Design a protein around this ligand. Sequence first.
Ligand SMILES: [Mg+2]
Ligand SMILES: [Mg+2]
Ligand SMILES: [Mg+2]
Ligand SMILES: [Mg+2]
Ligand SMILES: [Mg+2]
Ligand SMILES: [Mg+2]
Ligand SMILES: [Mg+2]
Ligand SMILES: [Mg+2]
Ligand SMILES: [Mg+2]
Ligand SMILES: [Mg+2]
Ligand SMILES: [Mg+2]
Ligand SMILES: [Mg+2]
Ligand SMILES: [Mg+2]
Ligand SMILES: [Mg+2]
Ligand SMILES: [Mg+2]
Ligand SMILES: [Mg+2]
Ligand SMILES: [Mg+2]
Ligand SMILES: [Mg+2]
Ligand SMILES: [Mg+2]
Ligand SMILES: [Mg+2]
Ligand SMILES: [Mg+2]
Ligand SMILES: [Mg+2]
Lengths: 200, 63, 67, 60, 145, 141, 80, 55, 143, 70
Amino acid sequence: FTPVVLATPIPEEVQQAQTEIKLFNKWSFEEVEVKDASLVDYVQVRQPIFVAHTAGRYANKRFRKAQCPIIERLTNSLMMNGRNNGKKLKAVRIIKHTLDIINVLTDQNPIQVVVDAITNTGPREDTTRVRRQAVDVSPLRRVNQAIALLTIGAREAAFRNIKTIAETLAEELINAAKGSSTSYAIKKKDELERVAKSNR
Amino acid sequence: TPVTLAKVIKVLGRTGSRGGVTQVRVEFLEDTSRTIVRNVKGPVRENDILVLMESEREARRLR
Amino acid sequence: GRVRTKTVKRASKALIERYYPKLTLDFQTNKRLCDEIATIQSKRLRNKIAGYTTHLMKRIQKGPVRG
Amino acid sequence: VLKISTRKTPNGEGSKTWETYEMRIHKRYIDLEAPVQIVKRITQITIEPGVDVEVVVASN
Amino acid sequence: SLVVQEQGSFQHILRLLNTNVDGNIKIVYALTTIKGVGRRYSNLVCKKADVDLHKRAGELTQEELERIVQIMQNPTHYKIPAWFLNRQNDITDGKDYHTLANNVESKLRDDLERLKKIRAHRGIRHFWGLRVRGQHTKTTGRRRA
Amino acid sequence: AVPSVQTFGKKKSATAVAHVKAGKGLIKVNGSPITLVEPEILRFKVYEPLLLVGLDKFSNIDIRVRVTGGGHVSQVYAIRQAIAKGLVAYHQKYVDEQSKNELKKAFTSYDRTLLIADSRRPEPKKFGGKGARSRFQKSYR
Amino acid sequence: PGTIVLYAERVQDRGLSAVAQAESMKFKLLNGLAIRRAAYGVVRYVMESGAKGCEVVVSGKLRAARAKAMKFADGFLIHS
Amino acid sequence: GNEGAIRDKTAGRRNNRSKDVTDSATTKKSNTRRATDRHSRTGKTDTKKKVNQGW
Amino acid sequence: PGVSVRDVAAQDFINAYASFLQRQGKLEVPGYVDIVKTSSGNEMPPQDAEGWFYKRAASVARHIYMRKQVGVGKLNKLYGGAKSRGVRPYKHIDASGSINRKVLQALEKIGIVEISPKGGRRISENGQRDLDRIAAQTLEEDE
Amino acid sequence: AQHAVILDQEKYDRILKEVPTYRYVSVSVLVDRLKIGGSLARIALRHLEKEGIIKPISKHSKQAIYTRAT
RNA sequence: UAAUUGCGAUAACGAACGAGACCUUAACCUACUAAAUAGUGGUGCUAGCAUUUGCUGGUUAUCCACUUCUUAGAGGGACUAUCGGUUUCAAGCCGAUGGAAGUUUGAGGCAAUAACAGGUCUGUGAUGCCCUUAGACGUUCUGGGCCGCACGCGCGCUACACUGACGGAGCCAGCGAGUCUAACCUUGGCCGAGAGGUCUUGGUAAUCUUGUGAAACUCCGUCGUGCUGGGGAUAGAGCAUUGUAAUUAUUGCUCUUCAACGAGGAAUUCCUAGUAAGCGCAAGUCAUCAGCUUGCGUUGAUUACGUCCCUGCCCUUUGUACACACC
Ligand SMILES: [Mg+2]
Ligand SMILES: [Mg+2]
Ligand SMILES: [Mg+2]
Ligand SMILES: [Mg+2]
Ligand SMILES: [Mg+2]
Ligand SMILES: [Mg+2]
Ligand SMILES: [Mg+2]
Ligand SMILES: [Mg+2]
Ligand SMILES: [Mg+2]
Ligand SMILES: [Mg+2]
Ligand SMILES: [Mg+2]
Ligand SMILES: [Mg+2]
Ligand SMILES: [Mg+2]
Ligand SMILES: [Mg+2]
Ligand SMILES: [Mg+2]
Ligand SMILES: [Mg+2]
Ligand SMILES: [Mg+2]
Ligand SMILES: [Mg+2]
Ligand SMILES: [Mg+2]
Ligand SMILES: [Mg+2]
Ligand SMILES: [Mg+2]
Ligand SMILES: [Mg+2]
């Protein structure tokens, strides 16, 4: 991999994770693909990024929020409840950990089980206060809502219990890789669409 | 689970009382050239894609 | 949400009215022109005036225009 | 920058509206190389009502 | 640290000083369930008595705990600062004591009843069951008397 | 006297003034090596310039920077940005243009404030609430 | 003594310095002129005195328990 | 005196918690004199050929 | 190559200097270390409790070396943290002015710091020797 | 104060044959099995690491992830 | 359109106030002027590790040069530019590129005509009238009170923890202030667990306090889900400081005491980008006392970029016997 040396020591691990195909600090970024036509063009990846910390204005204009690296937008959804408003770095560490775990058992690269977890938690349809009326939610409220439900559920499980936030988040998204009837997100989503039929 | 595939071609406007929903004409790129008009909940742009679960239904202006 | 005030539209119209041989369709030249041809009171003011003067000069070479 | 924040109303009624007053100060210094007789010719009109002109020499 | 294994050494239940102590809790914190104790007053005495706080409250050598009790019942004769206790210049013998367990409950009323017997305003306040340190009582402390 | 330049980077109130001498390819901010900074998880955000443009890219330069003001993340974001234009200015003066344009294009296509001098600033609070847009709670009798 | 001395300086075009005119309004209404007469006199004096614009307001009570307030302005005037 | 303050019964949160709250505690503004503002109560008026002499 | 203090990871460097000062023998502890929580701003004493004077005695010199001169007051402010005033808002208060004064004295007698002019205490010269060789062993950890 | 926050002599047998078949390990993973409390749980991990039990895929404190001995 | 901001229609044509303009603050200039009260490089002089010549510091001037960083003077820069999409293809709007910057560039300052029995005679030696004026409602001194506690309401502070408390350790801001007839901001040296004391010093201040080494936050450990070490109300005992005076405890420290509080009913607040929220800091107050306020920076989201359903307010039309104008 044509190594290069200088005066200050730059560890060979670093000397390995360069222009050579882009990965996360330790996870591959290519071969991660959305397995649902819908939300494609709305799950920003490849655009590889080694660490999810990007000082990018994503709200100056409405839709640029979709061009944001998903795992980062997913990470911004943790610095919530005041007690975590800010704490971005503490979050970044919880995610590097979380994926250190999803891959614990699932061989599948974490940057792919993430998309698999967002796929099965986007409500195809919902309801609104007209009784109620059946409504198809947008392809980005789809993601926004998927991330929101996944993180609130994991945050819900980490409270008053020894298990760490990273562990609960990991187990929640593994169950959400393909709905297994146990993630707070599969449940809420399916029931947020099981009432869209109530008005038809 | 028969699903669909619709791509918005033009935008209609804000329906519903609070104005948070929007009418939009969709277009299936499977058996294209067809007409359908569905309404959404999230914010949308031109050219997005959504999936219908009941292709034979269409609501109208919501009170 | 920037609809130029009529003070600027007023002056720019009065200028396309007397300086067409001059006032080329590129802003910079019009700005450097007004610095010597009009008694403006502020840089930003004359920039607004000149940019409008330019848009008007830009489209009259496409068709007519009021005033 | 000398700031003065105070409520506008002399009383304490209405909206609790505050008002910041400002006063800006400028003090520029030069180190000169002149003689013993131009000592007070720069004390002559080099003055401008409103400028505090202070000059004394030392290195200790 | 380092992994350890006691055969039957540690007894879960243990009462001493007329006060119970949990076996399954750490001994630097297990001790604090007595009155007049402190997470610091106990911390200090522990290795003053030469005990290793790293592990639990029951494995502890019986002789070691009697040494500890002696330390607290005789803290100044055994090099303890005179500003680390709650009974310095007590009120009648210019002595520096430490009130422990059953005795602190008493000493509280000892002083209380003094204040009352002498008619000091804060004594009257206490008898009436109010706040003594002068806090505003109008909007605070309303439903627990 | 050897070919060398000086550049900077500014994020929030932080300021990273950097100097690049023609040398052995040694890099250290505040006097310590880039090996460890610790905003550790955030260190890759400054390791990135090296790997983006190809990491050799240093065998005849020398990097060292100092940062005043800012915060634990303000300075880390300001220094990476303080070195990016350092290298570009170096190839501007001492090296040819083509190689420079290559660098500034490889940067612009990835850059997260790498060359853009982020304009965000702190908004000033206004009486009526301890916060920029927030107002004190109201009562309505 | 000697650290300061003051010298009187006649004022140019008094009809443009506000205070100069306000004190006049005071010292004429205090002499018994009609409120409107004195006010209109000072406003047109200030006008023939060069000033491009002028305005004078009188607030309070004059023989009427309830307080009124009248304006008197002429010419041009900017306020923003 | 102080002896009287303690000996004297009727004092203490006990002797007060045992009692009931005067309903005047939960009372409000009473809006005294906020609906008559526009109607001058001086029972007096100002003569027009008094004001005209004033202004 | 040539080692230096700036070239060592702060945590694992100071802890190495701690294990060294620890197994060397000349300490000069004021003897009063059974109680002090190192500041009023804190709740309880450090947990090491056999040592940690060496850990503070590693942070004592790393800092003073990286800086020209420093003073007991500056060290109190550095280590001092937020103090929970119970129900009142958190505020930062300086640390102990004595466990610092005689954390230096105790090792100046061991010669790693000198009472600097201009007021303060500059890094010692023999200390300037008791320098980065320590970092050499630190790097030996990754040899 | 419940369920053997302390040694549990005949549990030290359980730990050894329990570690295999696990794709994850953590202090939480330990107390998760009706077992040793966190204080004496967190301390066992490296004790096992001493001879081919795990593979330390994690790096720092407050979160630890080892894996099957290979 | 934020705007009676404009396009367009037009018995109106052309103007003015107010909006805009303007002013201030934050962002951009390696282009101008240059500065031991700002800083950079070289070099003296000098310290350590390695040694190959390197790497890291010291040095109120040892000298030489410079103005990128800092500072503040003068200019410049943006005018929604270019291209496109939309539209009476009008004002305009929307997307993309470029750009320090394209949400009135962000934030403020100013702000016409009128209206209220709105608040202020308790800011004024501003004031009309009325009251009192020597047993005073003048005034000063002494002590108490404004804190008084069965309860009702409102702005808040700390929490219910494991995105944690704790213990080391890593350690980074920005708005300010600061002592003459003086006791202000305080470095450093010692004594003290602490609070604090004591001995000197710099500073009328970009020169000294100060790099304000702040706090959150980062790292490494101890804890283990149990009111637990979360939590710190109440309370006892002692030590300090401010002050003529600390009792009803001014504030600080030490030990001990270890409540309620296990996410909050009906309801209601604030907010769209460096904003919310968390975090601490300076200033006002100030002998002592911030849980308040005015500013500051620190870490930094989620979700809008819509509508008139709720609510409020404007504008037309319309009715009117109101015009002291529905009180
Ligand atoms: Mg907190
Ligand atoms: Mg206790
Ligand atoms: Mg105007
Ligand atoms: Mg600190
Ligand atoms: Mg600390
Ligand atoms: Mg607290
Ligand atoms: Mg400059
Ligand atoms: Mg762009
Ligand atoms: Mg009234
Ligand atoms: Mg008044
Ligand atoms: Mg009066
Ligand atoms: Mg009061
Ligand atoms: Mg309020
Ligand atoms: Mg901590
Ligand atoms: Mg003592
Ligand atoms: Mg002096
Ligand atoms: Mg408890
Ligand atoms: Mg606590
Ligand atoms: Mg809640
Ligand atoms: Mg204060
Ligand atoms: Mg107040
Ligand atoms: Mg009518």
